[PDB]
């Protein structure tokens, strides 16, 4: 019947309760979350480039380094435009399909969101 939750960092009265996914203090009329008040970057497994930017499933990318292709005759050059990518589960994973050779996987650390 009693809350095992922390007090209120504003009242310390301890008359705090849990209303769903956080703690609400009915005293000072302010809800707060113990750890989430600090907040962190979650949903961050989205594929990020060496530019420090985040891509979108369908966005246009461009390798910013000289990358070879092992099974294909193609060599990936700084400016290799591959659009409409697929964001895979791992942040180190850009799935892309390339007219001609086929589908390929790209190292996030070697690619970049074009900006278009
Ligand atoms: Zn309070």
Coordinates of N, CA, C and O and ligand atoms in Angstrom, one line a residue:
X1 N 0.8 -1.2 0.0 CA 0.0 0.0 0.0 C 0.9 1.3 0.0 O 0.4 2.3 -0.3
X2 N 2.1 1.1 0.4 CA 3.0 2.2 0.4 C 4.0 2.1 -0.8 O 4.2 1.0 -1.3
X3 N 4.5 3.2 -1.2 CA 5.4 3.3 -2.3 C 6.8 3.0 -1.9 O 7.3 3.5 -0.9
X4 N 7.5 2.1 -2.6 CA 8.9 1.8 -2.4 C 9.8 2.7 -3.3 O 11.0 2.4 -3.5
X5 N 9.1 3.7 -3.7 CA 9.7 4.7 -4.7 C 10.5 5.7 -3.9 O 10.2 5.9 -2.7
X6 N 11.4 6.5 -4.5 CA 12.1 7.6 -3.9 C 11.2 8.7 -3.5 O 10.1 8.8 -4.0
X7 N 11.6 9.6 -2.6 CA 10.9 10.8 -2.2 C 10.8 11.8 -3.4 O 11.2 11.5 -4.5
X8 N 10.3 12.9 -3.0 CA 10.2 14.0 -4.0 C 11.4 14.9 -3.8 O 11.6 15.4 -2.7
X9 N 12.2 15.1 -4.9 CA 13.5 15.9 -4.8 C 13.1 17.4 -4.6 O 14.0 18.3 -4.8
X10 N 11.8 17.7 -4.3 CA 11.3 19.0 -4.1 C 10.7 19.1 -2.8 O 10.8 20.2 -2.1
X11 N 10.1 18.1 -2.2 CA 9.4 18.1 -0.9 C 10.1 17.2 0.1 O 10.4 17.6 1.2
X12 N 10.5 16.0 -0.4 CA 11.1 15.0 0.5 C 10.1 14.5 1.5 O 10.4 13.8 2.5
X13 N 8.8 14.8 1.3 CA 7.7 14.4 2.1 C 7.5 12.9 2.1 O 7.0 12.3 3.1
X14 N 7.8 12.3 0.9 CA 7.7 10.9 0.6 C 6.3 10.5 0.3 O 5.9 9.3 0.1
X15 N 5.4 11.5 0.1 CA 4.0 11.2 -0.3 C 4.0 11.1 -1.8 O 3.1 11.7 -2.4
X16 N 4.9 10.3 -2.3 CA 5.0 10.1 -3.7 C 4.4 8.8 -4.1 O 4.4 7.8 -3.3
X17 N 3.8 8.7 -5.3 CA 3.2 7.4 -5.8 C 3.6 7.2 -7.2 O 4.1 8.1 -7.9
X18 N 3.3 6.0 -7.7 CA 3.6 5.7 -9.1 C 2.3 5.8 -9.9 O 1.3 5.0 -9.7
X19 N 2.2 6.7 -10.9 CA 1.0 6.8 -11.8 C 1.4 6.4 -13.2 O 1.7 7.2 -14.0
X20 N 1.6 5.1 -13.4 CA 2.0 4.6 -14.7 C 3.5 4.3 -14.8 O 4.0 3.3 -14.3
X21 N 4.2 5.2 -15.5 CA 5.6 5.0 -15.9 C 6.5 6.0 -15.2 O 7.6 6.2 -15.7
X22 N 6.0 6.7 -14.2 CA 6.8 7.7 -13.5 C 6.3 7.9 -12.0 O 5.5 7.1 -11.6
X23 N 6.9 8.8 -11.3 CA 6.5 9.1 -10.0 C 5.8 10.5 -10.0 O 6.3 11.5 -10.6
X24 N 4.7 10.6 -9.4 CA 3.9 11.9 -9.3 C 3.8 12.3 -7.9 O 3.4 11.6 -7.0
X25 N 4.2 13.6 -7.6 CA 4.0 14.1 -6.3 C 2.7 15.0 -6.2 O 2.7 16.1 -6.8
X26 N 1.7 14.5 -5.5 CA 0.4 15.1 -5.4 C 0.5 16.4 -4.5 O -0.4 17.2 -4.4
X27 N 1.7 16.5 -3.9 CA 1.9 17.7 -3.0 C 2.3 18.9 -3.8 O 1.5 19.8 -3.8
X28 N 3.4 18.9 -4.5 CA 3.8 20.2 -5.2 C 3.3 20.2 -6.6 O 3.7 21.1 -7.4
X29 N 2.4 19.2 -7.0 CA 1.8 19.2 -8.3 C 2.8 19.1 -9.4 O 2.8 19.8 -10.4
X30 N 3.8 18.2 -9.3 CA 4.8 18.0 -10.3 C 5.2 16.5 -10.4 O 5.5 15.9 -9.4
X31 N 5.1 16.0 -11.6 CA 5.5 14.6 -11.8 C 6.9 14.6 -12.3 O 7.4 15.5 -12.9
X32 N 7.6 13.5 -12.0 CA 9.0 13.3 -12.4 C 9.4 11.9 -12.5 O 8.7 11.0 -12.0
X33 N 10.5 11.6 -13.2 CA 10.9 10.2 -13.3 C 12.3 10.1 -12.7 O 13.2 10.9 -13.0
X34 N 12.6 9.1 -11.8 CA 13.8 9.1 -11.0 C 15.1 9.1 -11.9 O 15.9 10.0 -11.7
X35 N 15.2 8.2 -12.8 CA 16.3 8.1 -13.7 C 16.1 8.9 -15.0 O 17.1 9.5 -15.5
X36 N 14.9 8.8 -15.5 CA 14.6 9.4 -16.8 C 14.7 10.9 -16.8 O 14.7 11.6 -17.8
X37 N 14.7 11.5 -15.6 CA 14.8 12.9 -15.4 C 16.2 13.4 -15.9 O 16.4 14.5 -16.4
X38 N 17.2 12.5 -15.8 CA 18.5 12.7 -16.3 C 18.5 12.5 -17.8 O 19.1 13.3 -18.6
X39 N 17.7 11.5 -18.3 CA 17.5 11.2 -19.7 C 18.8 10.7 -20.4 O 19.9 11.1 -20.0
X40 N 18.6 9.9 -21.4 CA 19.6 9.4 -22.2 C 19.2 9.2 -23.6 O 18.0 9.2 -23.9
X41 N 20.1 9.0 -24.5 CA 19.8 8.8 -25.9 C 19.4 7.3 -26.2 O 20.3 6.5 -26.4
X42 N 18.1 7.1 -26.2 CA 17.6 5.7 -26.5 C 17.2 5.7 -27.9 O 17.1 6.7 -28.6
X43 N 16.8 4.5 -28.4 CA 16.5 4.3 -29.8 C 17.7 4.7 -30.7 O 17.6 5.3 -31.7
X44 N 18.9 4.4 -30.2 CA 20.1 4.9 -30.8 C 20.8 3.8 -31.6 O 22.0 3.9 -31.7
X45 N 20.1 2.7 -32.0 CA 20.7 1.7 -32.8 C 20.5 2.0 -34.3 O 20.9 1.1 -35.1
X46 N 19.9 3.1 -34.6 CA 19.8 3.6 -35.9 C 21.2 3.9 -36.5 O 22.1 4.3 -35.8
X47 N 21.4 3.5 -37.8 CA 22.7 3.5 -38.4 C 23.3 4.9 -38.5 O 22.7 5.8 -39.1
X48 N 24.4 5.2 -37.8 CA 25.0 6.5 -37.9 C 26.3 6.5 -38.7 O 27.0 5.5 -38.8
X49 N 26.5 7.6 -39.4 CA 27.6 7.7 -40.3 C 28.9 8.2 -39.6 O 28.9 8.5 -38.4
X50 N 30.0 8.3 -40.3 CA 31.3 8.7 -39.8 C 31.2 10.3 -39.6 O 32.2 10.9 -39.1
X51 N 30.1 10.8 -40.1 CA 29.9 12.3 -40.0 C 29.3 12.6 -38.7 O 29.3 13.8 -38.3
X52 N 28.8 11.6 -38.0 CA 28.2 11.8 -36.7 C 26.7 12.0 -36.9 O 26.0 12.4 -35.9
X53 N 26.2 11.9 -38.1 CA 24.8 12.0 -38.4 C 24.1 10.7 -38.5 O 24.7 9.6 -38.7
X54 N 22.8 10.7 -38.5 CA 21.9 9.5 -38.5 C 21.2 9.4 -39.8 O 20.7 10.4 -40.3
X55 N 21.0 8.2 -40.3 CA 20.4 8.0 -41.6 C 18.9 7.6 -41.4 O 18.5 7.4 -40.3
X56 N 18.2 7.6 -42.6 CA 16.9 7.2 -42.6 C 16.7 6.1 -43.6 O 17.4 6.0 -44.6
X57 N 15.7 5.2 -43.3 CA 15.5 4.1 -44.3 C 14.8 4.7 -45.5 O 13.6 4.9 -45.6
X58 N 15.7 4.9 -46.5 CA 15.2 5.6 -47.8 C 16.1 6.8 -48.1 O 16.0 7.3 -49.2
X59 N 16.9 7.2 -47.1 CA 17.7 8.4 -47.3 C 18.9 8.1 -48.3 O 19.1 6.9 -48.7
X60 N 19.6 9.1 -48.7 CA 20.7 8.9 -49.6 C 22.0 8.9 -48.9 O 22.2 9.8 -48.0
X61 N 22.9 8.0 -49.2 CA 24.2 8.0 -48.5 C 25.3 8.2 -49.5 O 25.1 8.1 -50.7
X62 N 26.5 8.5 -49.0 CA 27.7 8.6 -49.8 C 28.9 8.3 -49.0 O 29.2 8.9 -48.0
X63 N 29.6 7.2 -49.4 CA 30.9 6.8 -48.8 C 31.9 8.0 -48.9 O 32.0 8.6 -49.9
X64 N 32.4 8.3 -47.7 CA 33.4 9.4 -47.7 C 34.9 8.9 -47.7 O 35.8 9.6 -47.4
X65 N 35.1 7.6 -48.1 CA 36.4 7.1 -48.2 C 36.6 6.1 -49.4 O 35.6 5.8 -50.0
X66 N 37.8 5.8 -49.7 CA 38.0 4.7 -50.7 C 37.8 3.3 -50.1 O 38.6 2.8 -49.3
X67 N 36.7 2.8 -50.5 CA 36.3 1.4 -50.1 C 36.3 0.5 -51.3 O 35.7 0.8 -52.3
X68 N 36.9 -0.6 -51.2 CA 36.9 -1.6 -52.3 C 35.6 -2.5 -52.2 O 34.9 -2.4 -51.2
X69 N 35.3 -3.3 -53.2 CA 34.3 -4.3 -53.1 C 34.9 -5.6 -53.5 O 35.4 -5.8 -54.6
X70 N 34.8 -6.6 -52.6 CA 35.6 -7.8 -52.7 C 35.1 -8.7 -53.9 O 35.9 -9.2 -54.7
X71 N 33.8 -8.9 -54.0 CA 33.3 -9.8 -55.0 C 32.9 -9.1 -56.3 O 32.6 -9.8 -57.3
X72 N 32.9 -7.8 -56.3 CA 32.5 -7.1 -57.5 C 33.7 -6.3 -58.0 O 34.6 -5.9 -57.3
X73 N 33.6 -6.0 -59.3 CA 34.7 -5.3 -60.0 C 34.6 -3.8 -59.6 O 35.6 -3.1 -59.9
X74 N 33.6 -3.4 -58.9 CA 33.4 -2.0 -58.6 C 34.2 -1.6 -57.4 O 34.4 -2.4 -56.4
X75 N 34.8 -0.5 -57.4 CA 35.5 0.1 -56.3 C 34.7 1.3 -55.8 O 34.4 2.2 -56.6
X76 N 34.4 1.3 -54.5 CA 33.7 2.4 -53.9 C 34.5 3.6 -53.6 O 35.5 3.5 -52.8
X77 N 34.2 4.7 -54.2 CA 35.0 5.9 -54.1 C 34.3 7.0 -53.3 O 33.0 7.0 -53.3
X78 N 35.0 7.8 -52.6 CA 34.5 8.9 -51.8 C 33.5 9.7 -52.7 O 33.9 10.6 -53.5
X79 N 32.2 9.4 -52.6 CA 31.2 10.1 -53.4 C 30.3 9.1 -54.0 O 29.4 9.4 -54.9
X80 N 30.5 7.8 -53.7 CA 29.7 6.7 -54.1 C 28.3 6.9 -53.6 O 28.0 6.7 -52.4
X81 N 27.4 7.3 -54.5 CA 26.0 7.6 -54.1 C 25.1 6.4 -54.1 O 24.9 5.8 -55.2
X82 N 24.6 6.0 -52.9 CA 23.7 4.9 -52.8 C 22.5 5.4 -52.0 O 22.6 5.7 -50.8
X83 N 21.3 5.6 -52.7 CA 20.2 6.1 -52.1 C 19.2 5.0 -51.7 O 19.3 3.9 -52.1
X84 N 18.2 5.4 -50.9 CA 17.1 4.6 -50.5 C 17.6 3.4 -49.7 O 17.2 2.2 -49.9
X85 N 18.6 3.6 -48.8 CA 19.1 2.5 -47.9 C 18.1 1.9 -47.0 O 17.0 2.4 -46.9
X86 N 18.5 0.9 -46.3 CA 17.8 0.2 -45.3 C 18.5 0.2 -44.0 O 19.7 -0.2 -44.0
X87 N 17.9 0.7 -42.9 CA 18.6 0.7 -41.7 C 18.5 -0.7 -41.0 O 17.3 -1.1 -40.7
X88 N 19.6 -1.4 -40.8 CA 19.5 -2.7 -40.2 C 19.5 -2.6 -38.7 O 19.5 -1.5 -38.1
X89 N 19.4 -3.7 -38.0 CA 19.3 -3.8 -36.6 C 20.5 -3.1 -35.9 O 20.4 -2.3 -35.0
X90 N 21.7 -3.5 -36.4 CA 22.9 -2.9 -35.8 C 23.3 -1.6 -36.3 O 23.2 -1.4 -37.5
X91 N 23.7 -0.7 -35.5 CA 24.2 0.7 -35.8 C 25.3 0.6 -36.8 O 25.6 1.6 -37.5
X92 N 26.0 -0.5 -36.9 CA 27.1 -0.7 -37.8 C 26.7 -1.4 -39.1 O 27.3 -2.4 -39.5
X93 N 25.6 -1.0 -39.7 CA 24.9 -1.8 -40.7 C 24.0 -1.0 -41.6 O 22.9 -0.6 -41.2
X94 N 24.5 -0.7 -42.8 CA 23.6 -0.1 -43.8 C 23.3 -1.1 -44.9 O 24.3 -1.5 -45.6
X95 N 22.1 -1.4 -45.1 CA 21.7 -2.3 -46.2 C 21.3 -1.5 -47.4 O 20.5 -0.6 -47.3
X96 N 21.9 -1.9 -48.5 CA 21.6 -1.1 -49.7 C 21.6 -2.1 -50.9 O 22.1 -3.1 -50.9
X97 N 20.9 -1.6 -52.0 CA 20.8 -2.4 -53.2 C 21.3 -1.5 -54.3 O 20.9 -0.4 -54.5
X98 N 22.2 -2.1 -55.1 CA 22.9 -1.3 -56.1 C 22.7 -1.9 -57.5 O 23.0 -3.1 -57.7
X99 N 22.1 -1.1 -58.4 CA 21.8 -1.5 -59.7 C 23.1 -2.0 -60.4 O 24.1 -1.3 -60.5
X100 N 23.0 -3.2 -60.9 CA 24.1 -3.8 -61.6 C 24.7 -5.0 -60.8 O 24.4 -6.2 -61.2
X101 N 25.5 -4.8 -59.8 CA 26.1 -5.8 -59.0 C 25.1 -6.5 -58.1 O 25.1 -7.8 -58.1
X102 N 24.3 -5.7 -57.4 CA 23.3 -6.3 -56.5 C 23.3 -5.6 -55.2 O 23.6 -4.4 -55.1
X103 N 22.9 -6.3 -54.1 CA 22.8 -5.7 -52.8 C 24.2 -5.8 -52.1 O 24.9 -6.8 -52.3
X104 N 24.5 -4.8 -51.2 CA 25.7 -4.8 -50.5 C 25.5 -4.2 -49.1 O 24.5 -3.6 -48.8
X105 N 26.5 -4.4 -48.2 CA 26.4 -3.9 -46.9 C 27.6 -2.9 -46.7 O 28.7 -3.1 -47.2
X106 N 27.3 -1.8 -46.0 CA 28.3 -0.7 -45.9 C 28.6 -0.5 -44.4 O 27.8 -0.6 -43.5
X107 N 29.9 -0.1 -44.2 CA 30.4 0.2 -42.9 C 30.0 1.7 -42.6 O 30.4 2.6 -43.3
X108 N 29.2 1.8 -41.5 CA 28.7 3.1 -41.1 C 29.9 4.1 -41.0 O 29.7 5.3 -41.3
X109 N 31.0 3.6 -40.5 CA 32.2 4.5 -40.3 C 32.8 5.0 -41.6 O 33.7 5.8 -41.6
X110 N 32.4 4.4 -42.7 CA 32.9 4.9 -44.0 C 31.9 5.6 -44.8 O 32.2 6.1 -45.9
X111 N 30.6 5.7 -44.3 CA 29.6 6.3 -45.1 C 29.1 7.6 -44.5 O 29.5 8.0 -43.5
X112 N 28.3 8.3 -45.3 CA 27.8 9.6 -44.9 C 26.4 9.9 -45.5 O 26.1 9.6 -46.6
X113 N 25.5 10.5 -44.6 CA 24.3 11.0 -45.1 C 24.6 12.2 -46.0 O 25.2 13.2 -45.6
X114 N 24.2 12.1 -47.3 CA 24.4 13.1 -48.3 C 23.8 14.5 -47.8 O 24.4 15.5 -47.7
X115 N 22.5 14.4 -47.5 CA 21.8 15.6 -47.1 C 20.6 16.0 -48.0 O 19.9 17.0 -47.8
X116 N 20.5 15.1 -49.0 CA 19.4 15.2 -50.0 C 18.5 14.0 -49.9 O 17.3 14.1 -49.3
Ligands
LIG1 ZN1 6.8 17.4 -4.3

